[PDB]
Design a protein around this motif. Structure first.
Motif: not given
Ligand SMILES: CCOc1ccc(CC(=O)O)cc1
Lengths: 171, 172
Positions: B99-108
């Motif tokens: 897995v390629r990691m990205g940003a800290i996020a809030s999602m539904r």
């Protein structure tokens, strides 16, 4: 019921059950001394070789638990495939590969003909779980299209750097 | 991934957890059996529990896994890090999903609100299914990566999108 159950240890590498009677592998991994495979005498096995691609057709059902899958001669340029790597450690290692043109290259020592691709794990493995090793030859290339899995060839080679891979294809 | 990392991955509740050290166990909050009052022979009253959303850490007052060395737990990882998610599947099969990691996020995701480090699977083009992607039983599996000399743990599996392409690692 799994794609992964079709990937089987064979010779110096691996192969893949397309159907109960059809097995595909990389030519260079096949034992050069044999009287039988999977308990069936070589007497009764049809062998179709095209360079680094080999298909076996058995005269009885070796894997009657399986349905028959779509086998094609490579895939469209730009298709992102998965190479279904099994390791003797017990790891299952599906890796994304961006597929390109049919080509000939001198991957390390020798000349190889097949469908070129580039691994999409990038940077560098340093850490065997992001790249191929010699023992992985025969692993299948697959992708999902509509509702079906398509198998489009087998792992034949990978460059020193690990970046470029060659998928041997049918005819 | 080395055998000593797979040995730390433990069946727990509706998913998994991971031994950081002989006294420290991490997991995904939603896989914890909510009626449970005893863990590894120890009462609740003898365990320090630290909860941040979908990340839960248990610290025991005795060594539960004295076979293990303490390793490094980080609060997520730099953007662009490639992790392996250490997933166990039916029959001693080991599935270290890249897995390629990205940003800290809030999602539904599937109607639920989730917060953690987003990433995208490097296993194939679409990953909707158990062969190339995650399933709900995978929650709590650890996100690990290799550096020059060692390995780090940086969170636990919390969620995945319907498409399968995006995953979320809950972080300390
Ligand atoms: C649909 C596939 O499109 C692309 C996939 C991967 C890349 C990145 C790379 O090739 O390293 C670029 C384009």
């Amino acid at each position: 019921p799994t794609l992964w159950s079709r990937v089987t240890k064979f010779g110096s590498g691996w192969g893949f059950w397309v159907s109960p009677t059809v097995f595909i592998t990389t030519t260079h991994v096949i034992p050069t001394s044999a009287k039988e495979f999977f308990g069936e005498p070589l007497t009764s096995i049809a062998i179709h070789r095209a360079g680094e691609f080999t298909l076996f057709r058995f005269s009885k059902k070796i894997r009657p638990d399986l349905t028959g899958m779509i086998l094609e001669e490579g895939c469209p340029e730009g298709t992102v495939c998965s190479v279904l790597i099994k390791r003797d450690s017990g790891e299952l290692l599906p890796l994304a590969v961006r597929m390109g043109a049919i080509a000939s290259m001198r991957i390390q020592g020798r000349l190889v003909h097949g469908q070129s691709g580039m691994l999409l794990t990038g940077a560098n493995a340093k850490g065997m779980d992001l790249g191929t090793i010699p023992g992985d030859c025969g692993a299948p290339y697959v992708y999902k299209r509509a509702n079906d899995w398509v198998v489009c060839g087998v792992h034949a080679a990978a460059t020193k750097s690990g970046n470029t891979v060659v998928c041997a294809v049918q005819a």
